[PDB]
Amino acid sequence: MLSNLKTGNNILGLPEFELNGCRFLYKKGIEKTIITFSAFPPKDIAQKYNYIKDFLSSNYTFLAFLDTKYPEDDARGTYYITNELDNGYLQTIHCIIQLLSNTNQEDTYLLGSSKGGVGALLLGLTYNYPNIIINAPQAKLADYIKTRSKTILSYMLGTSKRFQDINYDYINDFLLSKIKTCDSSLKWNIHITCGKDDSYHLNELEILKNEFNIKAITIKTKLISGGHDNEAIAHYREYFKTIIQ
Amino acid sequence: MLSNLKTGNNILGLPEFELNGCRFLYKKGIEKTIITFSAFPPKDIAQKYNYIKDFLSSNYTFLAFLDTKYPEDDARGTYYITNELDNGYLQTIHCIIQLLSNTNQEDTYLLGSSKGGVGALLLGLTYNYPNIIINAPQAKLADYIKTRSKTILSYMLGTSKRFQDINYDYINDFLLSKIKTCDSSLKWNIHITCGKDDSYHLNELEILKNEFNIKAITIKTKLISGGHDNEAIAHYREYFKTIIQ
Amino acid sequence: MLSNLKTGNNILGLPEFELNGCRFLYKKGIEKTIITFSAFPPKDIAQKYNYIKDFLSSNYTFLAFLDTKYPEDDARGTYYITNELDNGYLQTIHCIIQLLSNTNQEDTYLLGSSKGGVGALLLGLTYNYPNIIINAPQAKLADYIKTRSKTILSYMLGTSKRFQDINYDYINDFLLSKIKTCDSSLKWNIHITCGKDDSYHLNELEILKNEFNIKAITIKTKLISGGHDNEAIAHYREYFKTIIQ
Amino acid sequence: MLSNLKTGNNILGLPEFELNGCRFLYKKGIEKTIITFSAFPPKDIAQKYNYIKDFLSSNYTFLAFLDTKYPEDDARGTYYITNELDNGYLQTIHCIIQLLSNTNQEDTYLLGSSKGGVGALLLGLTYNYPNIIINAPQAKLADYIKTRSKTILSYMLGTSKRFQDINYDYINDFLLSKIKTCDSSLKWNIHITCGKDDSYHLNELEILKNEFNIKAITIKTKLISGGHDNEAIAHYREYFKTIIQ
Numbered sequence: 001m002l003s004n005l006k007t008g009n010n011i012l013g014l015p016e017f018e019l020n021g022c023r024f025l026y027k028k029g030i031e032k033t034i035i036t037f038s039a040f041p042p043k044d045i046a047q048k049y050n051y052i053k054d055f056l057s058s059n060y061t062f063l064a065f066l067d068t069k070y071p072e073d074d075a076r077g078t079y080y081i082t083n084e085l086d087n088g089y090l091q092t093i094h095c096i097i098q099l100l101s102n103t104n105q106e107d108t109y110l111l112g113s114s115k116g117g118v119g120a121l122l123l124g125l126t127y128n129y130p131n132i133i134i135n136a137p138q139a140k141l142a143d144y145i146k147t148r149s150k151t152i153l154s155y156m157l158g159t160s161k162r163f164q165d166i167n168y169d170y171i172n173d174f175l176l177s178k179i180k181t182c183d184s185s186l187k188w189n190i191h192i193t194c195g196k197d198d199s200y201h202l203n204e205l206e207i208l209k210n211e212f213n214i215k216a217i218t219i220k221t222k223l224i225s226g227g228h229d230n231e232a233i234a235h236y237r238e239y240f241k242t243i244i245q
Numbered sequence: 246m247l248s249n250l251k252t253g254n255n256i257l258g259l260p261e262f263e264l265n266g267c268r269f270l271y272k273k274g275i276e277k278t279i280i281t282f283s284a285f286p287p288k289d290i291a292q293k294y295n296y297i298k299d300f301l302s303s304n305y306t307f308l309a310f311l312d313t314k315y316p317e318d319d320a321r322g323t324y325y326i327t328n329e330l331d332n333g334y335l336q337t338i339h340c341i342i343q344l345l346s347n348t349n350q351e352d353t354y355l356l357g358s359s360k361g362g363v364g365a366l367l368l369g370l371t372y373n374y375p376n377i378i379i380n381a382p383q384a385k386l387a388d389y390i391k392t393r394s395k396t397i398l399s400y401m402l403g404t405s406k407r408f409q410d411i412n413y414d415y416i417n418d419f420l421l422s423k424i425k426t427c428d429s430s431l432k433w434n435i436h437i438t439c440g441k442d443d444s445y446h447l448n449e450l451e452i453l454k455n456e457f458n459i460k461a462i463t464i465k466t467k468l469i470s471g472g473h474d475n476e477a478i479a480h481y482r483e484y485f486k487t488i489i490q
Numbered sequence: 491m492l493s494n495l496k497t498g499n500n501i502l503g504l505p506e507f508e509l510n511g512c513r514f515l516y517k518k519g520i521e522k523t524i525i526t527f528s529a530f531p532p533k534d535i536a537q538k539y540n541y542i543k544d545f546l547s548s549n550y551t552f553l554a555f556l557d558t559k560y561p562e563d564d565a566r567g568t569y570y571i572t573n574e575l576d577n578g579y580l581q582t583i584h585c586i587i588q589l590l591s592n593t594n595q596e597d598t599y600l601l602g603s604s605k606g607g608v609g610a611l612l613l614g615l616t617y618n619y620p621n622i623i624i625n626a627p628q629a630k631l632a633d634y635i636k637t638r639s640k641t642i643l644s645y646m647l648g649t650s651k652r653f654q655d656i657n658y659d660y661i662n663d664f665l666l667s668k669i670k671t672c673d674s675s676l677k678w679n680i681h682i683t684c685g686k687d688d689s690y691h692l693n694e695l696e697i698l699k700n701e702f703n704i705k706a707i708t709i710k711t712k713l714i715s716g717g718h719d720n721e722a723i724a725h726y727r728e729y730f731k732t733i734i735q
Numbered sequence: 736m737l738s739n740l741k742t743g744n745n746i747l748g749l750p751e752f753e754l755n756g757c758r759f760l761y762k763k764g765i766e767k768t769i770i771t772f773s774a775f776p777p778k779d780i781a782q783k784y785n786y787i788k789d790f791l792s793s794n795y796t797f798l799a800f801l802d803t804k805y806p807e808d809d810a811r812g813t814y815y816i817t818n819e820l821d822n823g824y825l826q827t828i829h830c831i832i833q834l835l836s837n838t839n840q841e842d843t844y845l846l847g848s849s850k851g852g853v854g855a856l857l858l859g860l861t862y863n864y865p866n867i868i869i870n871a872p873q874a875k876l877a878d879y880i881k882t883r884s885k886t887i888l889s890y891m892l893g894t895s896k897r898f899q900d901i902n903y904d905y906i907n908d909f910l911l912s913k914i915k916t917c918d919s920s921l922k923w924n925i926h927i928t929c930g931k932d933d934s935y936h937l938n939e940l941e942i943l944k945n946e947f948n949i950k951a952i953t954i955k956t957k958l959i960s961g962g963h964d965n966e967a968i969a970h971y972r973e974y975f976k977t978i979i980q
């Protein structure tokens with residue numbers, strides 16, 4: 001039962017649950033379901049639940065998810081991809097939302113920035129969540145992990161030297177593949193912001209945009225002030241609060 | 246949202262749900278949680294939910310599960326094993342139980358006969374559901390599938406002629422591997438009945454018994470009247486009723 | 491020191507040593523160095539040193555090698571290929587021979603049947619041992635392991651489903667690749683016998699012969715009585731004793 | 736046969752051997768076994784065997800090792816790491832020591848300065864050689880190689896531009912990983928001297944000290960006169976002589 005899934009941790013008065021290695025916060029509300037995804041924290045900093053304070057007074061239904069618990073020596077997550085490089089973790093997140101949420105899919109909103117934005121896209125494109133409002137997601141996943149933690153990257157690549165380049169390309173294109181295989185008939189409502197001084201993720205956004213374009217998916221984009229920093233996040237928070245209401 | 250997972254089918258008044266290709270019935274109750282697994286139906290007959298009548302008049306929480314929906318040519322299930330020959334389907338069933346059940350695992354009872362009994366064992370050994378009360382499960386799953394449907398077996402073995410032998414053995418030993426890798430420290434409460442005229446499955450039970458013996462796990466076995474038929478099912482239904490009550 | 495490498499096991503009065511996971515027997519003699527390789531024993535039977543009784547009274551220098559100690563649940567060896575599918579085990583065998591032998595390379599003889607014959611070829615072709623007198627070796631290594639133990643084959647293939655076919659082909663061609671890359675200017679002295687009723691390995695010998703042929707390597711072959719059994723081994727023993735003397 | 740491994744080179748009367756690309760000197764003695772490792776020579780100067788004079792008049796067993804023979808453009812060694820960035824070279828050195836030495840590991844002493852001290856640590860931590868008496872080893876190996884030879888570093892990083900950063904970090908942490916994975920239960924006897932004017936390597940020792948500290952292994956350190964120069968080498972030579980005698 002859900003009460004038995006409690007980890008015994010409380011974040012800002014919200015109990016933490018864990019199911020199949022997937023840690024999450026859950027608050028039952030009304031009208032809408034808000035889903036947030038964690039980004040890469042700094043090294044030796046624990047993974048953080050995102051945007052709790054924006055919706056604690058809102059009385060919306062709120063679910064916040066963390067990334068996986070691996071690798072053990074740098075436990076900042078594996079981009080919501082399993083040790084087997086498949087959808088097993090996304091599948092668990094989907095089951096949690098579908099059973100705990102008390103609103104329709106059209107009234108559910110996936111939120112996240114950077115790696116958290118990618119997790120939102122991965123879940124949304126795999127399982128048909130139409131409302132995705134995210135900031136500065138990556139396009140080439142392996143290239144970015146390389147710039148954040150060699151420990152996590154080498155972990156996902158695996159031990160066998162003969163498959164390192166193959167696994168690199170597979171991880172690098174994991175999100176682009178989800179775009180290539182998604183349902184183009186869905187009424188997608190995808191919003192992507194990006195700090196105007198975040199040149200790296202401005203280029204990543206164009207890579208993502210080209211994939212959506214050829215799938216006949218028109219997304220909304222907005223340039224905000226800042227780089228890949230707390231200033232962009234501040235304006236991204238103002239953005240998703242606006243369109244949600 | 247649970248109600249949005251409905252398929253439109255209705256079995257004895259209970260609405261059918263589907264999540265990630267997993268079809269189930271659900272009735273919320275109190276005190277105990279009863280889980281039932283589907284067995285092979287006759288060819289061209291729809292997969293059936295098991296033991297609805299024995300618990301529909303009860304006040305317990307009730308979850309009934311079917312097997313997978315593939316292959317389309319003979320959609321009688323793949324022994325709760327995915328297309329990829331992994332735990333993805335059992336993981337979905339686990340999440341459904343954990344989020345919809347309102348009792349401890351110690352107050353949860355897994356029921357099933359033949360393939361249904363295997364599905365109960367597969368789930369219970371993977372995720373530590375201690376109470377498993379089943380009838381006449383198989384030990385060599387691939388050997389049995391071969392007798393019931395060449396179409397299903399051929400689908401599970403895959404297109405590559407070189408890996409057909411490999412996949413066959415893997416499927417054949419899928420349940421035995423779960424026994425070898427389960428948690429011996431848990432206080433298992435496993436009951437396995439078998440018809441005294443069910444010579445094939447009496448030998449299958451001897452194989453299962455040995456694997457448990459090697460793992461220093463003791464189970465309860467009981468011989469009942471009948472073969473691999475409705476006579477055994479009747480006495481097994483009575484047996485589980487007395488253990489549960 | 492060599493005395494400290496003793497495992498504390500004695501085979502027919504010969505002490506067993508182990509260096510870097512490589513178990514071997516060593517007897518210091520004169521004139522010639524005899525090297526033997528173990529074949530696949532029956533299931534649940536320990537790996538056996540080969541042809542001890544042929545050379546115990548000979549006073550030649552004698553070294554007998556076993557295969558690796560993996561997988562742990564079917565420890566009959568991995569065709570002298572490491573867990574990483576590379577030459578690390580062959581490398582250890584080479585170091586042992588080069589340092590413990592007291593005769594030239596031209597006075598060293600590699601012996602073995604079936605998998606033992608393949609180990610002799612793998613070592614001989616990698617490190618330029620000219621004298622190789624073997625019986626009924628395999629050509630397609632993975633095809634043959636499949637027919638002997640699914641446990642060992644699945645072990646060498648690895649866990650990642652996406653690389654099973656790639657690793658299958660890599661193991662299957664491991665010996666053929668060694669032939670393709672060997673030194674064709676060496677004065678090779680390769681003798682391969684095969685039981686005349688061993689149709690399977692008669693075809694394997696032709697596959698090997700074609701690879702040698704295009705490398706301009708002429709080998710000697712002899713048909714002996716028997717299949718892949720103790721009768722062929724008996725005549726193979728008579729064969730290598732003859733040409734050695 | 737050992738004598739057939741000779742290269743034709745002769746260093747101070749001792750004949751040079753080579754096995755699997757590993758060049759070594761060997762003098763059989765009694766009571767103790769001394770192992771020395773080569774450090775970086777000047778550009779276009781041949782790799783040199785270390786501490787021959789200190790032990791050539793001694794009655795101990797003596798083994799002196801050089802680094803690898805690649806890259807051909809600047810063949811000053813790759814820090815005892817193979818082309819494949821694995822333990823293959825250290826494995827060869829281990830086999831040479833184990834089969835040619837006539838003493839226990841407790842009576843074996845690993846000596847070396849700078850890169851030679853790293854090679855001693857790499858071997859001793861991988862294969863449990865407890866007595867390691869070295870001077871001024873590096874901690875971040877790739878950082879140091881970069882200062883000594885761009886040609887060697889570029890060779891070790893590989894042709895693929897995408898894996899150059901990855902391989903750099905892997906090489907950089909190769910020694911630290913050996914510390915993290917070594918056997919803490921062994922009675923290590925590690926002595927590390929460093930010149931008081933060798934500010935770069937005093938900081939490198941602080942990094943090494945911390946890794947040992949975390950692994951609950953205590954080592955002996957001593958400050959000697961000089962920098963990273965022949966003055967330190969002189970006092971370190973005296974130091975090891977007193978510990979050994």
Ligand SMILES: CC(=O)N[C@@H]1[C@@H](OP(=O)(O)OC[C@H]2O[C@H](OP(=O)(O)OC[C@H]3O[C@H](OP(=O)(O)OC[C@H]4O[C@H](O)[C@@H](NC(C)=O)[C@@H](O)[C@@H]4O)[C@@H](NC(C)=O)[C@@H](O)[C@@H]3O)[C@@H](NC(C)=O)[C@@H](O)[C@@H]2O)O[C@H](CO)[C@@H](O)[C@@H]1O
Pocket residue numbers: 038039040041042043048049050051113114115136146147148149150227228229230232233
């Ligand atoms: C940029 C880079 O490549 N750096 C690497 C370095 O990576 P590192 O992991 O060691 O550290 C990265 C980076 O962290 C520090 O800078 P920031 O704090 O600006 O970025 C951290 C992190 O912020 C977001 O994730 P988050 O931590 O979960 O924060 C979410 C928000 O939610 C909180 O609750 C809020 N707090 C409130 C309301 O009170 C907010 O403050 C939070 O922002 C993500 N950013 C975005 C835009 O989404 C995430 O992407 C981001 O990484 C800083 N480190 C310090 C001060 O210690 C900085 O120096 C550091 O670079 O390691 C690699 C090694 O490979 C290097 O190559 C490179 O330096």
Ligand SMILES: CC(=O)N[C@@H]1[C@@H](OP(=O)(O)OC[C@H]2O[C@H](OP(=O)(O)OC[C@H]3O[C@H](OP(=O)(O)OC[C@H]4O[C@H](O)[C@@H](NC(C)=O)[C@@H](O)[C@@H]4O)[C@@H](NC(C)=O)[C@@H](O)[C@@H]3O)[C@@H](NC(C)=O)[C@@H](O)[C@@H]2O)O[C@H](CO)[C@@H](O)[C@@H]1O
Pocket residue numbers: 528529530531532533538539540541603604605626636637638639640717718719720722723
């Ligand atoms: C053929 C096949 O595909 N069988 C598989 C089965 O494999 P399995 O591993 O379970 O058993 C194989 C096979 O074993 C028994 O038949 P054999 O004894 O004729 O073959 C065994 C074995 O002999 C040689 O290796 P060795 O054991 O190391 O013997 C070397 C010699 O040295 C000894 O010292 C001598 N003894 C003296 C002097 O006193 C000799 O006796 C020894 O021969 C190898 N053979 C050759 C030609 O080189 C090796 O290749 C060979 O395998 C028998 N098993 C019994 C009686 O229990 C037989 O039934 C069995 O088939 O498992 C797979 C599952 O995937 C099946 O598909 C298939 O049945």
Ligand SMILES: [Cl-]
Pocket residue numbers: 039040041113114115116
């Ligand atoms: Cl991030």
Ligand SMILES: [Cl-]
Pocket residue numbers: 284285286358359360361
């Ligand atoms: Cl059935």
Ligand SMILES: [Cl-]
Pocket residue numbers: 529530531603604605606
């Ligand atoms: Cl064999």
Ligand SMILES: [Cl-]
Pocket residue numbers: 774775776848849850851
């Ligand atoms: Cl140096």
